Amino acid sequence: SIDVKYIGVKSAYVSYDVQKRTIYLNITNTLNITNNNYYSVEVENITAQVQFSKTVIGKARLNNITIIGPLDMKQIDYTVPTVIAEEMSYMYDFCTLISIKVHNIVLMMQVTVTTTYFGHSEQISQERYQYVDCG
Amino acid sequence: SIDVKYIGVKSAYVSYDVQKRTIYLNITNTLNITNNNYYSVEVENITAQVQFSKTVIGKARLNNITIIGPLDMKQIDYTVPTVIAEEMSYMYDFCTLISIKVHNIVLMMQVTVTTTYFGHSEQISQERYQYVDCG
Amino acid sequence: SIDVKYIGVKSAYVSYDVQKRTIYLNITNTLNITNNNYYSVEVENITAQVQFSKTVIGKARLNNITIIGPLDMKQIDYTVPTVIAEEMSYMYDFCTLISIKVHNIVLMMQVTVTTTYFGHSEQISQERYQYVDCG
């Protein structure tokens, strides 16, 4: 990868930015640029590539075979009872949360059992996260 | 990888930035640039690449075979009972949280059982995180 | 990898930045740059690469075979009971948290059982983290 940048606020080549309650008087500028970028990414000069796969079974006897794939889940349990009794009193709540399995991002590729691969593979993730905000 | 940058606020080539309650008077500037970037990334000169895979079974007897994949889960349990009794009193809450399995990012690649791979593979993650904010 | 930089606030080539309550008067500047960058990353001159894999089973007898993958979980348990009784009194809370298995980032690659690999592999992670903020 090339130039995978995360900028918090602002990005530029040249910036003359002026913000607040300042004062200019008689400012002069100038700029001369000769930029050039000969990207030559991910090029191939191949004569004979032979991917392959096979299986040969002869005079065999096979019984009770099991091939699971990854990331299984079984017999899980969640129990979040919230009981509230009360009598002749005073209560008050604010910004109460109960969270179970709260996802944000799930990126999956080549999640297989068998995988012959030739080439490139990328996974990029840029974000600004904030779960709870109260006051 | 090339140029994987995380900038907190601001990024530039040249920056003349002026912020607050300042004073300019008779400023002069100038710039002469000859930038150039001959990226030649990830190039191939291959004559004969032969990926492969196979299996040969002959006059065999196989019984009760099991091949799990990675990242299994079984018989897990969570129990978060929240009971509140009360009598002739006063209560008050603010910014109360109960979190179970709160994910943000999950990036998975080539999560397999068998994997023949030829080439490149990347995984980039840039972020600004903040879970709880109260007051 | 090349140029994997984490900058807290600001990044530049040249910076003339002026912030607050300052005073300029009759400033002069000048700049002459001849930058150049001949990246030649990850190049290949290969004549014959032969990845491979195989299995041959003959006149065999195999019984009760098990091949788990990595990162299993079994019979786990969590028990966080929160009981509150009260009588003729006064209570008060603020910014109370109960967290169980709170993830932020999970990056996984080539999490396999078998893996023939030829090439490159990267995993980059840049972040600014903050869990709880109260007051």
Side-chain angles (χ1 to χ4, degrees), chain B residues 1 6 9 15 23 25 32 34 37-38 45 58 81 87 104 107 121 129, chain C residues 7 9 16 24 26 33 35 37 39 46 57 82 88 104 106 117 122 128:
Chain B
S1 64
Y6 169 104
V9 173
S15 298
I23 295 190
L25 268 173
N32 184 355
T34 173
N37 315 95
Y38 296 179
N45 194 335
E87 201 265 7
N104 174 31
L107 258 62
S121 302
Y129 178 97
Chain C
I7 293 91
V9 173
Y16 296 176
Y24 272 7
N26 193 342
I33 310 170
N35 187 352
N37 315 95
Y39 305 95
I46 295 181
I57 308 170
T82 295
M88 209 172 305
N104 174 31
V106 175
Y117 196 101
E122 283 156 10
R128 169 204 206 281

PDB file of all heavy atoms in Angstrom, chain B residues 1 6 9 15 23 25 32 34 37-38 45 58 81 87 104 107 121 129, chain C residues 7 9 16 24 26 33 35 37 39 46 57 82 88 104 106 117 122 128:
ATOM      1  N   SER B   1       4.769  -1.740   2.790  1.00  0.00           N
ATOM      2  CA  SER B   1       3.949  -0.534   2.784  1.00  0.00           C
ATOM      3  C   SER B   1       4.818   0.718   2.775  1.00  0.00           C
ATOM      4  O   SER B   1       5.972   0.686   3.197  1.00  0.00           O
ATOM      5  CB  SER B   1       3.015  -0.516   3.993  1.00  0.00           C
ATOM      6  OG  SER B   1       3.751  -0.453   5.202  1.00  0.00           O
ATOM      7  N   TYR B   6      -0.277   8.563  10.661  1.00  0.00           N
ATOM      8  CA  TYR B   6      -1.407   8.974  11.485  1.00  0.00           C
ATOM      9  C   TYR B   6      -1.043  10.331  12.056  1.00  0.00           C
ATOM     10  O   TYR B   6      -0.137  10.432  12.886  1.00  0.00           O
ATOM     11  CB  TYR B   6      -1.680   7.955  12.595  1.00  0.00           C
ATOM     12  CG  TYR B   6      -2.655   8.404  13.662  1.00  0.00           C
ATOM     13  CD1 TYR B   6      -3.948   7.923  13.686  1.00  0.00           C
ATOM     14  CD2 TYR B   6      -2.277   9.286  14.658  1.00  0.00           C
ATOM     15  CE1 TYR B   6      -4.834   8.327  14.657  1.00  0.00           C
ATOM     16  CE2 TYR B   6      -3.155   9.695  15.620  1.00  0.00           C
ATOM     17  CZ  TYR B   6      -4.430   9.211  15.616  1.00  0.00           C
ATOM     18  OH  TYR B   6      -5.308   9.620  16.585  1.00  0.00           O
ATOM     19  N   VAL B   9      -3.621  16.182  14.088  1.00  0.00           N
ATOM     20  CA  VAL B   9      -4.436  17.316  13.672  1.00  0.00           C
ATOM     21  C   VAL B   9      -4.224  17.676  12.204  1.00  0.00           C
ATOM     22  O   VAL B   9      -5.145  17.541  11.391  1.00  0.00           O
ATOM     23  CB  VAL B   9      -4.170  18.530  14.580  1.00  0.00           C
ATOM     24  CG1 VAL B   9      -4.872  19.752  14.044  1.00  0.00           C
ATOM     25  CG2 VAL B   9      -4.641  18.239  15.984  1.00  0.00           C
ATOM     26  N   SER B  15       3.336  25.199   5.309  1.00  0.00           N
ATOM     27  CA  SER B  15       2.228  25.738   6.085  1.00  0.00           C
ATOM     28  C   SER B  15       2.610  27.098   6.635  1.00  0.00           C
ATOM     29  O   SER B  15       3.610  27.216   7.349  1.00  0.00           O
ATOM     30  CB  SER B  15       1.859  24.797   7.230  1.00  0.00           C
ATOM     31  OG  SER B  15       1.422  23.544   6.749  1.00  0.00           O
ATOM     32  N   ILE B  23      -0.734  39.567  14.622  1.00  0.00           N
ATOM     33  CA  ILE B  23      -0.670  40.718  13.729  1.00  0.00           C
ATOM     34  C   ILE B  23       0.407  40.443  12.692  1.00  0.00           C
ATOM     35  O   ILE B  23       1.567  40.214  13.048  1.00  0.00           O
ATOM     36  CB  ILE B  23      -0.365  42.030  14.476  1.00  0.00           C
ATOM     37  CG1 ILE B  23      -1.496  42.396  15.438  1.00  0.00           C
ATOM     38  CG2 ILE B  23      -0.160  43.160  13.498  1.00  0.00           C
ATOM     39  CD1 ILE B  23      -1.377  43.774  16.023  1.00  0.00           C
ATOM     40  N   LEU B  25       2.399  42.258   9.349  1.00  0.00           N
ATOM     41  CA  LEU B  25       2.708  43.519   8.681  1.00  0.00           C
ATOM     42  C   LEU B  25       3.871  43.305   7.720  1.00  0.00           C
ATOM     43  O   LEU B  25       4.982  42.989   8.152  1.00  0.00           O
ATOM     44  CB  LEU B  25       3.034  44.620   9.692  1.00  0.00           C
ATOM     45  CG  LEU B  25       1.885  45.505  10.177  1.00  0.00           C
ATOM     46  CD1 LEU B  25       2.303  46.443  11.282  1.00  0.00           C
ATOM     47  CD2 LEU B  25       1.450  46.328   9.010  1.00  0.00           C
ATOM     48  N   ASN B  32      10.082  27.389  -4.376  1.00  0.00           N
ATOM     49  CA  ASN B  32      10.427  26.710  -5.621  1.00  0.00           C
ATOM     50  C   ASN B  32      10.622  25.236  -5.299  1.00  0.00           C
ATOM     51  O   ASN B  32      11.502  24.889  -4.509  1.00  0.00           O
ATOM     52  CB  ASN B  32      11.691  27.324  -6.254  1.00  0.00           C
ATOM     53  CG  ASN B  32      12.038  26.721  -7.617  1.00  0.00           C
ATOM     54  OD1 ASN B  32      11.397  25.778  -8.080  1.00  0.00           O
ATOM     55  ND2 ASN B  32      13.058  27.275  -8.265  1.00  0.00           N
ATOM     56  N   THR B  34      10.793  21.149  -6.899  1.00  0.00           N
ATOM     57  CA  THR B  34      10.813  20.126  -7.952  1.00  0.00           C
ATOM     58  C   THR B  34      10.777  18.741  -7.301  1.00  0.00           C
ATOM     59  O   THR B  34      11.795  18.062  -7.151  1.00  0.00           O
ATOM     60  CB  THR B  34      12.015  20.303  -8.906  1.00  0.00           C
ATOM     61  OG1 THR B  34      12.090  19.191  -9.807  1.00  0.00           O
ATOM     62  CG2 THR B  34      13.312  20.476  -8.172  1.00  0.00           C
ATOM     63  N   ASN B  37       8.612  11.358  -7.748  1.00  0.00           N
ATOM     64  CA  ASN B  37       8.498  10.138  -6.962  1.00  0.00           C
ATOM     65  C   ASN B  37       8.244   8.961  -7.887  1.00  0.00           C
ATOM     66  O   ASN B  37       7.106   8.742  -8.306  1.00  0.00           O
ATOM     67  CB  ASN B  37       7.373  10.279  -5.951  1.00  0.00           C
ATOM     68  CG  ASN B  37       7.395  11.607  -5.244  1.00  0.00           C
ATOM     69  OD1 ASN B  37       6.709  12.542  -5.642  1.00  0.00           O
ATOM     70  ND2 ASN B  37       8.173  11.697  -4.179  1.00  0.00           N
ATOM     71  N   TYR B  38       9.291   8.192  -8.189  1.00  0.00           N
ATOM     72  CA  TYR B  38       9.191   7.049  -9.102  1.00  0.00           C
ATOM     73  C   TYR B  38       8.896   5.788  -8.295  1.00  0.00           C
ATOM     74  O   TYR B  38       9.755   4.935  -8.100  1.00  0.00           O
ATOM     75  CB  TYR B  38      10.467   6.862  -9.912  1.00  0.00           C
ATOM     76  CG  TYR B  38      10.841   7.972 -10.856  1.00  0.00           C
ATOM     77  CD1 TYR B  38      11.996   7.882 -11.613  1.00  0.00           C
ATOM     78  CD2 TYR B  38      10.055   9.099 -11.000  1.00  0.00           C
ATOM     79  CE1 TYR B  38      12.363   8.881 -12.481  1.00  0.00           C
ATOM     80  CE2 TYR B  38      10.415  10.107 -11.867  1.00  0.00           C
ATOM     81  CZ  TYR B  38      11.572   9.990 -12.606  1.00  0.00           C
ATOM     82  OH  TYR B  38      11.946  10.985 -13.477  1.00  0.00           O
ATOM     83  N   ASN B  45       8.608 -10.370 -12.380  1.00  0.00           N
ATOM     84  CA  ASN B  45       9.175 -10.919 -13.610  1.00  0.00           C
ATOM     85  C   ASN B  45       9.316 -12.417 -13.368  1.00  0.00           C
ATOM     86  O   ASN B  45      10.378 -12.890 -12.960  1.00  0.00           O
ATOM     87  CB  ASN B  45      10.507 -10.259 -13.947  1.00  0.00           C
ATOM     88  CG  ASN B  45      10.965 -10.549 -15.358  1.00  0.00           C
ATOM     89  OD1 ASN B  45      10.595 -11.561 -15.948  1.00  0.00           O
ATOM     90  ND2 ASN B  45      11.783  -9.662 -15.907  1.00  0.00           N
ATOM     91  N   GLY B  58      -5.571 -44.689  -1.224  1.00  0.00           N
ATOM     92  CA  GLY B  58      -5.716 -45.964  -1.904  1.00  0.00           C
ATOM     93  C   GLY B  58      -5.699 -47.175  -0.995  1.00  0.00           C
ATOM     94  O   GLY B  58      -4.759 -47.363  -0.217  1.00  0.00           O
ATOM     95  N   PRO B  81     -27.229 -10.602  37.053  1.00  0.00           N
ATOM     96  CA  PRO B  81     -28.490 -10.162  37.652  1.00  0.00           C
ATOM     97  C   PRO B  81     -28.281  -8.864  38.410  1.00  0.00           C
ATOM     98  O   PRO B  81     -27.326  -8.727  39.173  1.00  0.00           O
ATOM     99  CB  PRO B  81     -28.857 -11.311  38.598  1.00  0.00           C
ATOM    100  CG  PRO B  81     -27.877 -12.406  38.311  1.00  0.00           C
ATOM    101  CD  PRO B  81     -26.662 -11.739  37.784  1.00  0.00           C
ATOM    102  N   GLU B  87     -37.164   0.680  50.288  1.00  0.00           N
ATOM    103  CA  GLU B  87     -38.284   0.937  51.183  1.00  0.00           C
ATOM    104  C   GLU B  87     -38.066   2.261  51.889  1.00  0.00           C
ATOM    105  O   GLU B  87     -37.109   2.400  52.654  1.00  0.00           O
ATOM    106  CB  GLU B  87     -38.429  -0.188  52.193  1.00  0.00           C
ATOM    107  CG  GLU B  87     -39.803  -0.278  52.817  1.00  0.00           C
ATOM    108  CD  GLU B  87     -39.889   0.441  54.143  1.00  0.00           C
ATOM    109  OE1 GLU B  87     -38.911   1.118  54.517  1.00  0.00           O
ATOM    110  OE2 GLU B  87     -40.929   0.320  54.819  1.00  0.00           O
ATOM    111  N   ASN B 104     -15.607  -3.278  18.805  1.00  0.00           N
ATOM    112  CA  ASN B 104     -15.536  -2.133  17.914  1.00  0.00           C
ATOM    113  C   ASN B 104     -15.103  -2.510  16.508  1.00  0.00           C
ATOM    114  O   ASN B 104     -15.795  -2.181  15.546  1.00  0.00           O
ATOM    115  CB  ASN B 104     -14.593  -1.078  18.484  1.00  0.00           C
ATOM    116  CG  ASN B 104     -14.371   0.060  17.537  1.00  0.00           C
ATOM    117  OD1 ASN B 104     -15.248   0.411  16.760  1.00  0.00           O
ATOM    118  ND2 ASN B 104     -13.190   0.647  17.589  1.00  0.00           N
ATOM    119  N   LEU B 107     -11.206  -7.386  12.123  1.00  0.00           N
ATOM    120  CA  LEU B 107     -10.683  -7.573  10.780  1.00  0.00           C
ATOM    121  C   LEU B 107     -10.045  -8.946  10.713  1.00  0.00           C
ATOM    122  O   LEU B 107      -9.126  -9.239  11.480  1.00  0.00           O
ATOM    123  CB  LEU B 107      -9.667  -6.489  10.437  1.00  0.00           C
ATOM    124  CG  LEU B 107     -10.140  -5.351   9.543  1.00  0.00           C
ATOM    125  CD1 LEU B 107     -11.242  -4.584  10.201  1.00  0.00           C
ATOM    126  CD2 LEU B 107      -8.991  -4.437   9.228  1.00  0.00           C
ATOM    127  N   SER B 121      -0.097  -9.177   1.305  1.00  0.00           N
ATOM    128  CA  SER B 121      -1.171  -9.186   2.293  1.00  0.00           C
ATOM    129  C   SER B 121      -0.970  -8.029   3.255  1.00  0.00           C
ATOM    130  O   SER B 121       0.117  -7.872   3.812  1.00  0.00           O
ATOM    131  CB  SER B 121      -1.210 -10.504   3.061  1.00  0.00           C
ATOM    132  OG  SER B 121      -1.378 -11.602   2.187  1.00  0.00           O
ATOM    133  N   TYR B 129     -10.230   6.492  19.508  1.00  0.00           N
ATOM    134  CA  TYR B 129     -11.220   5.750  20.270  1.00  0.00           C
ATOM    135  C   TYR B 129     -11.517   6.455  21.585  1.00  0.00           C
ATOM    136  O   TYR B 129     -10.644   7.094  22.176  1.00  0.00           O
ATOM    137  CB  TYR B 129     -10.711   4.337  20.516  1.00  0.00           C
ATOM    138  CG  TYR B 129     -11.582   3.429  21.334  1.00  0.00           C
ATOM    139  CD1 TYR B 129     -12.435   2.539  20.731  1.00  0.00           C
ATOM    140  CD2 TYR B 129     -11.497   3.412  22.707  1.00  0.00           C
ATOM    141  CE1 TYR B 129     -13.204   1.686  21.472  1.00  0.00           C
ATOM    142  CE2 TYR B 129     -12.266   2.567  23.453  1.00  0.00           C
ATOM    143  CZ  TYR B 129     -13.116   1.706  22.833  1.00  0.00           C
ATOM    144  OH  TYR B 129     -13.885   0.855  23.578  1.00  0.00           O
TER     145      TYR B 129
ATOM    146  N   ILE C   7       2.268  10.929  14.326  1.00  0.00           N
ATOM    147  CA  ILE C   7       2.533  12.285  14.785  1.00  0.00           C
ATOM    148  C   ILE C   7       1.391  12.711  15.689  1.00  0.00           C
ATOM    149  O   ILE C   7       0.220  12.570  15.328  1.00  0.00           O
ATOM    150  CB  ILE C   7       2.712  13.268  13.617  1.00  0.00           C
ATOM    151  CG1 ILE C   7       3.980  12.954  12.829  1.00  0.00           C
ATOM    152  CG2 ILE C   7       2.788  14.670  14.140  1.00  0.00           C
ATOM    153  CD1 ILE C   7       3.778  12.009  11.688  1.00  0.00           C
ATOM    154  N   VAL C   9       0.398  15.759  16.775  1.00  0.00           N
ATOM    155  CA  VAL C   9      -0.412  16.895  16.354  1.00  0.00           C
ATOM    156  C   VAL C   9      -0.201  17.246  14.885  1.00  0.00           C
ATOM    157  O   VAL C   9      -1.121  17.109  14.073  1.00  0.00           O
ATOM    158  CB  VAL C   9      -0.140  18.113  17.255  1.00  0.00           C
ATOM    159  CG1 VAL C   9      -0.837  19.335  16.712  1.00  0.00           C
ATOM    160  CG2 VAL C   9      -0.611  17.832  18.660  1.00  0.00           C
ATOM    161  N   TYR C  16       5.883  27.619   8.947  1.00  0.00           N
ATOM    162  CA  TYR C  16       6.142  28.978   9.421  1.00  0.00           C
ATOM    163  C   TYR C  16       5.101  29.404  10.445  1.00  0.00           C
ATOM    164  O   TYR C  16       4.857  30.589  10.643  1.00  0.00           O
ATOM    165  CB  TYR C  16       6.160  29.955   8.252  1.00  0.00           C
ATOM    166  CG  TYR C  16       7.257  29.775   7.219  1.00  0.00           C
ATOM    167  CD1 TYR C  16       7.295  30.572   6.096  1.00  0.00           C
ATOM    168  CD2 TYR C  16       8.270  28.853   7.384  1.00  0.00           C
ATOM    169  CE1 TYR C  16       8.291  30.440   5.154  1.00  0.00           C
ATOM    170  CE2 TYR C  16       9.267  28.712   6.438  1.00  0.00           C
ATOM    171  CZ  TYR C  16       9.272  29.511   5.328  1.00  0.00           C
ATOM    172  OH  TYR C  16      10.255  29.390   4.379  1.00  0.00           O
ATOM    173  N   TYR C  24       4.160  39.990  13.970  1.00  0.00           N
ATOM    174  CA  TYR C  24       5.135  40.083  12.894  1.00  0.00           C
ATOM    175  C   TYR C  24       5.377  41.534  12.499  1.00  0.00           C
ATOM    176  O   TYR C  24       4.538  42.404  12.740  1.00  0.00           O
ATOM    177  CB  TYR C  24       4.699  39.314  11.650  1.00  0.00           C
ATOM    178  CG  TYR C  24       5.080  37.854  11.572  1.00  0.00           C
ATOM    179  CD1 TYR C  24       5.656  37.187  12.632  1.00  0.00           C
ATOM    180  CD2 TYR C  24       5.016  37.197  10.354  1.00  0.00           C
ATOM    181  CE1 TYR C  24       6.033  35.866  12.504  1.00  0.00           C
ATOM    182  CE2 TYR C  24       5.401  35.895  10.211  1.00  0.00           C
ATOM    183  CZ  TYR C  24       5.911  35.231  11.279  1.00  0.00           C
ATOM    184  OH  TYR C  24       6.288  33.925  11.107  1.00  0.00           O
ATOM    185  N   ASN C  26       7.746  42.956   8.954  1.00  0.00           N
ATOM    186  CA  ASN C  26       8.764  42.923   7.902  1.00  0.00           C
ATOM    187  C   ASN C  26       9.577  41.627   7.943  1.00  0.00           C
ATOM    188  O   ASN C  26      10.776  41.617   8.204  1.00  0.00           O
ATOM    189  CB  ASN C  26       9.681  44.146   7.995  1.00  0.00           C
ATOM    190  CG  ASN C  26      10.542  44.331   6.748  1.00  0.00           C
ATOM    191  OD1 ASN C  26      10.722  43.404   5.959  1.00  0.00           O
ATOM    192  ND2 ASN C  26      11.068  45.537   6.564  1.00  0.00           N
ATOM    193  N   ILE C  33      13.844  23.777  -3.260  1.00  0.00           N
ATOM    194  CA  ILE C  33      13.838  22.351  -2.965  1.00  0.00           C
ATOM    195  C   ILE C  33      13.974  21.571  -4.258  1.00  0.00           C
ATOM    196  O   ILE C  33      13.316  21.891  -5.251  1.00  0.00           O
ATOM    197  CB  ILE C  33      12.546  21.926  -2.244  1.00  0.00           C
ATOM    198  CG1 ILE C  33      12.278  22.837  -1.054  1.00  0.00           C
ATOM    199  CG2 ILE C  33      12.623  20.475  -1.824  1.00  0.00           C
ATOM    200  CD1 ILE C  33      10.928  22.639  -0.432  1.00  0.00           C
ATOM    201  N   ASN C  35      13.586  17.707  -4.286  1.00  0.00           N
ATOM    202  CA  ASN C  35      13.342  16.411  -3.680  1.00  0.00           C
ATOM    203  C   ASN C  35      13.073  15.382  -4.762  1.00  0.00           C
ATOM    204  O   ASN C  35      12.613  15.709  -5.856  1.00  0.00           O
ATOM    205  CB  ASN C  35      12.159  16.480  -2.726  1.00  0.00           C
ATOM    206  CG  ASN C  35      11.972  15.210  -1.952  1.00  0.00           C
ATOM    207  OD1 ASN C  35      12.629  14.209  -2.221  1.00  0.00           O
ATOM    208  ND2 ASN C  35      11.065  15.231  -0.985  1.00  0.00           N
ATOM    209  N   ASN C  37      12.597  10.756  -5.039  1.00  0.00           N
ATOM    210  CA  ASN C  37      12.478   9.541  -4.245  1.00  0.00           C
ATOM    211  C   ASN C  37      12.217   8.360  -5.163  1.00  0.00           C
ATOM    212  O   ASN C  37      11.080   8.143  -5.581  1.00  0.00           O
ATOM    213  CB  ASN C  37      11.354   9.692  -3.235  1.00  0.00           C
ATOM    214  CG  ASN C  37      11.383  11.024  -2.536  1.00  0.00           C
ATOM    215  OD1 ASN C  37      10.701  11.959  -2.939  1.00  0.00           O
ATOM    216  ND2 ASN C  37      12.162  11.116  -1.471  1.00  0.00           N
ATOM    217  N   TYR C  39      11.617   5.069  -5.090  1.00  0.00           N
ATOM    218  CA  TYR C  39      11.197   3.841  -4.433  1.00  0.00           C
ATOM    219  C   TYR C  39      11.248   2.690  -5.424  1.00  0.00           C
ATOM    220  O   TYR C  39      10.798   2.823  -6.561  1.00  0.00           O
ATOM    221  CB  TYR C  39       9.789   3.988  -3.883  1.00  0.00           C
ATOM    222  CG  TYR C  39       9.613   5.157  -2.960  1.00  0.00           C
ATOM    223  CD1 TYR C  39       9.137   6.358  -3.430  1.00  0.00           C
ATOM    224  CD2 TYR C  39       9.911   5.054  -1.620  1.00  0.00           C
ATOM    225  CE1 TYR C  39       8.957   7.422  -2.592  1.00  0.00           C
ATOM    226  CE2 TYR C  39       9.742   6.116  -0.775  1.00  0.00           C
ATOM    227  CZ  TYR C  39       9.268   7.300  -1.268  1.00  0.00           C
ATOM    228  OH  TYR C  39       9.097   8.368  -0.429  1.00  0.00           O
ATOM    229  N   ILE C  46      12.116 -13.797 -10.770  1.00  0.00           N
ATOM    230  CA  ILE C  46      12.056 -15.218 -10.462  1.00  0.00           C
ATOM    231  C   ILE C  46      11.878 -15.998 -11.752  1.00  0.00           C
ATOM    232  O   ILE C  46      11.097 -15.604 -12.624  1.00  0.00           O
ATOM    233  CB  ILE C  46      10.914 -15.532  -9.479  1.00  0.00           C
ATOM    234  CG1 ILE C  46      11.181 -14.872  -8.138  1.00  0.00           C
ATOM    235  CG2 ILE C  46      10.757 -17.025  -9.296  1.00  0.00           C
ATOM    236  CD1 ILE C  46      10.116 -15.148  -7.130  1.00  0.00           C
ATOM    237  N   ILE C  57      -1.851 -41.843   1.100  1.00  0.00           N
ATOM    238  CA  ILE C  57      -2.231 -42.812   2.116  1.00  0.00           C
ATOM    239  C   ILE C  57      -2.533 -44.123   1.415  1.00  0.00           C
ATOM    240  O   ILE C  57      -3.381 -44.166   0.517  1.00  0.00           O
ATOM    241  CB  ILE C  57      -3.441 -42.334   2.927  1.00  0.00           C
ATOM    242  CG1 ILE C  57      -3.180 -40.932   3.470  1.00  0.00           C
ATOM    243  CG2 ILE C  57      -3.738 -43.298   4.048  1.00  0.00           C
ATOM    244  CD1 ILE C  57      -4.384 -40.283   4.081  1.00  0.00           C
ATOM    245  N   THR C  82     -25.257  -8.080  41.031  1.00  0.00           N
ATOM    246  CA  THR C  82     -25.216  -6.796  41.724  1.00  0.00           C
ATOM    247  C   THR C  82     -26.555  -6.605  42.429  1.00  0.00           C
ATOM    248  O   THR C  82     -27.542  -6.205  41.807  1.00  0.00           O
ATOM    249  CB  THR C  82     -24.916  -5.653  40.760  1.00  0.00           C
ATOM    250  OG1 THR C  82     -23.601  -5.820  40.220  1.00  0.00           O
ATOM    251  CG2 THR C  82     -24.985  -4.318  41.478  1.00  0.00           C
ATOM    252  N   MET C  88     -34.967   3.177  54.409  1.00  0.00           N
ATOM    253  CA  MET C  88     -35.028   4.428  55.165  1.00  0.00           C
ATOM    254  C   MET C  88     -33.699   5.175  55.141  1.00  0.00           C
ATOM    255  O   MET C  88     -33.241   5.695  56.158  1.00  0.00           O
ATOM    256  CB  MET C  88     -35.476   4.172  56.605  1.00  0.00           C
ATOM    257  CG  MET C  88     -36.210   5.333  57.243  1.00  0.00           C
ATOM    258  SD  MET C  88     -36.901   4.901  58.845  1.00  0.00           S
ATOM    259  CE  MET C  88     -37.872   3.465  58.410  1.00  0.00           C
ATOM    260  N   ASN C 104     -11.675  -3.619  21.609  1.00  0.00           N
ATOM    261  CA  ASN C 104     -11.600  -2.479  20.711  1.00  0.00           C
ATOM    262  C   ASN C 104     -11.168  -2.866  19.307  1.00  0.00           C
ATOM    263  O   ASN C 104     -11.860  -2.539  18.344  1.00  0.00           O
ATOM    264  CB  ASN C 104     -10.651  -1.425  21.275  1.00  0.00           C
ATOM    265  CG  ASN C 104     -10.424  -0.293  20.321  1.00  0.00           C
ATOM    266  OD1 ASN C 104     -11.300   0.058  19.542  1.00  0.00           O
ATOM    267  ND2 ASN C 104      -9.241   0.288  20.369  1.00  0.00           N
ATOM    268  N   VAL C 106      -9.442  -6.106  16.828  1.00  0.00           N
ATOM    269  CA  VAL C 106      -8.988  -7.479  16.657  1.00  0.00           C
ATOM    270  C   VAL C 106      -8.587  -7.629  15.200  1.00  0.00           C
ATOM    271  O   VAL C 106      -9.445  -7.599  14.315  1.00  0.00           O
ATOM    272  CB  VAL C 106     -10.052  -8.518  17.030  1.00  0.00           C
ATOM    273  CG1 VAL C 106      -9.544  -9.900  16.722  1.00  0.00           C
ATOM    274  CG2 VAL C 106     -10.418  -8.413  18.487  1.00  0.00           C
ATOM    275  N   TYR C 117       3.141 -20.117   2.509  1.00  0.00           N
ATOM    276  CA  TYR C 117       3.073 -18.708   2.179  1.00  0.00           C
ATOM    277  C   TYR C 117       4.348 -18.268   1.485  1.00  0.00           C
ATOM    278  O   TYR C 117       5.450 -18.641   1.892  1.00  0.00           O
ATOM    279  CB  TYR C 117       2.851 -17.879   3.429  1.00  0.00           C
ATOM    280  CG  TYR C 117       2.387 -16.479   3.159  1.00  0.00           C
ATOM    281  CD1 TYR C 117       1.061 -16.136   3.293  1.00  0.00           C
ATOM    282  CD2 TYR C 117       3.278 -15.498   2.774  1.00  0.00           C
ATOM    283  CE1 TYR C 117       0.637 -14.862   3.049  1.00  0.00           C
ATOM    284  CE2 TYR C 117       2.863 -14.226   2.531  1.00  0.00           C
ATOM    285  CZ  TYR C 117       1.543 -13.912   2.667  1.00  0.00           C
ATOM    286  OH  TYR C 117       1.127 -12.633   2.423  1.00  0.00           O
ATOM    287  N   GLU C 122       1.893  -7.727   6.280  1.00  0.00           N
ATOM    288  CA  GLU C 122       1.976  -6.548   7.120  1.00  0.00           C
ATOM    289  C   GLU C 122       0.788  -6.487   8.060  1.00  0.00           C
ATOM    290  O   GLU C 122      -0.270  -7.058   7.797  1.00  0.00           O
ATOM    291  CB  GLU C 122       2.022  -5.274   6.291  1.00  0.00           C
ATOM    292  CG  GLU C 122       3.357  -5.006   5.672  1.00  0.00           C
ATOM    293  CD  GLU C 122       3.261  -4.132   4.443  1.00  0.00           C
ATOM    294  OE1 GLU C 122       2.174  -3.580   4.189  1.00  0.00           O
ATOM    295  OE2 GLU C 122       4.276  -4.002   3.727  1.00  0.00           O
ATOM    296  N   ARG C 128      -5.329   6.430  19.023  1.00  0.00           N
ATOM    297  CA  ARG C 128      -5.323   7.168  20.276  1.00  0.00           C
ATOM    298  C   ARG C 128      -6.514   6.691  21.083  1.00  0.00           C
ATOM    299  O   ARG C 128      -7.656   6.836  20.643  1.00  0.00           O
ATOM    300  CB  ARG C 128      -5.407   8.667  20.036  1.00  0.00           C
ATOM    301  CG  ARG C 128      -5.674   9.453  21.287  1.00  0.00           C
ATOM    302  CD  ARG C 128      -6.307  10.778  20.948  1.00  0.00           C
ATOM    303  NE  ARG C 128      -6.037  11.785  21.962  1.00  0.00           N
ATOM    304  CZ  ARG C 128      -6.681  11.870  23.117  1.00  0.00           C
ATOM    305  NH1 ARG C 128      -7.637  11.004  23.414  1.00  0.00           N
ATOM    306  NH2 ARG C 128      -6.367  12.823  23.977  1.00  0.00           N
TER     307      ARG C 128
END
